[PDB]
From Swiss-Prot:
Name of this protein: Coproporphyrin III ferrochelatase
One Pfam family of this chain: Ferrochelatase
pH dependence: Optimum pH is 7.2 with Zn(2+) and protoporphyrin IX as substrates.
Species classification: Bacteria, Bacillati, Bacillota, Bacilli, Bacillales
Catalytic activities: Fe-coproporphyrin III + 2 H(+) = coproporphyrin III + Fe(2+)
Length: 311
């Protein structure tokens, strides 16, 4: 009969309603409650992007669709998905405890961010494993990165091809592709963290597959701490490249992100769009993966490869 496995799907998390913003951002800010002006600003940003409720729904849909798709495409394992989040319930440790309570003894985990880093992916995986160890009798094998899964590369390659094909001739000959991920503190370098190298490799692979010769790599959405974060930031990079070469279209591929959350809908589609509007360039940002079948199939392949059950 089929082996039962937990499928632990991990992510940063998102507020579920406007009244969750305070606690969610306090958590991101390591216990520092946002001041009233910042709370109001954040509410306004979420209103501007179309509201909060759709956001956590994406992550739930990704986990649910991944469970169902994994269960349909092979006949050896029955997976049950559990969501574990960093900054709001259900927390990672809660998800692991629920797996253990439900009788799961063997699980596979994946983080909804394709590049490994010490700051996020490794920390999530270690937290999950540490909770399993505390409870006993449950083991987890963890996906560490998946940016190089061919099906995932192809998702973005094909979105980029469609965007370039849609352009007027003058833009298609004078466009710049900006490939980005969430900035992290530069000090990850002290550990040899491969996160920057992996973003650069994503960009190489996507530009190569799409036949785009002119591209650049940037970072976005840095936090506010006294130590430096990876740069350049996409807003600065856009303006600098425009000053250097006069590109008249910018195409943003925020490959580090998997969903229509604040980082994409605001930090690209508002903040980068301010810059492109200021310089007179066209703005393009192809569809994020969200829970679409092509992306879910890529993730299912990642999981089955991690378990050795497909070549
Ligand atoms: Cl890795
Ligand atoms: Mg209300
Ligand atoms: Mg402001
Ligand atoms: Mg690998
Ligand atoms: Mg910002
Ligand atoms: Mg600084």
């Amino acid at each position: 009969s089929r082996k039962k496995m937990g499928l632990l799907v991990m992510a940063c998390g998102t507020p579920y309603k406007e009244e969750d913003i305070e606690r969610y951002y306090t958590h991101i800010r390591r216990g520092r409650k946002p001041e009233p002006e910042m709370l109001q600003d954040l509410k306004d940003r979420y209103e501007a992007i179309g509201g909060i409720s759709p956001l956590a729904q994406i992550t739930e849909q990704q986990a649910h669709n991944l469970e169902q798709h994994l269960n349909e495409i092979q006949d050896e394992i029955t997976f049950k998905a559990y969501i574990g989040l960093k900054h709001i319930e259900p927390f990672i440790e809660d998800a692991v405890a629920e797996m253990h309570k439900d009788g799961i003894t063997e699980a596979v985990s994946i983080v909804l961010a394709p590049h490994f880093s010490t700051f996020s992916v490794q920390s999530y995986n270690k937290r999950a494993k540490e909770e399993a160890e505390k409870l006993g009798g449950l083991t987890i094998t963890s996906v560490e990165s998946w940016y190089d899964e061919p099906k995932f590369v192809t998702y973005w390659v094909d979105r980029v091809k469609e965007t370039y094909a849609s352009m007027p001739e003058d833009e298609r000959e004078n466009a710049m592709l900006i490939v980005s991920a969430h900035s992290l503190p530069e000090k990850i370098k002290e550990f040899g963290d491969p996160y920057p190298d992996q973003l650069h490799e994503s960009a190489k692979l996507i530009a190569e597959g799409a036949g785009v010769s002119e591209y650049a790599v940037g970072w976005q959405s840095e936090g506010n701490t006294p130590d430096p974060w990876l740069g350049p930031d996409v807003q600065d990079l856009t303006r600098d490249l425009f000053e250097q070469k006069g590109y008249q279209a910018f195409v943003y591929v925020p490959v580090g992100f998997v969903a229509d959350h604040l980082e994409v809908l605001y930090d690209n589609d508002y903040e980068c769009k301010v810059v492109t509007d200021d310089i007179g360039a066209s703005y393009y940002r192809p569809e994020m993966p969200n829970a679409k079948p092509e992306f879910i199939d890529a993730l299912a392949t990642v999981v089955l490869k991690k378990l050795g059950r497909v070549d």
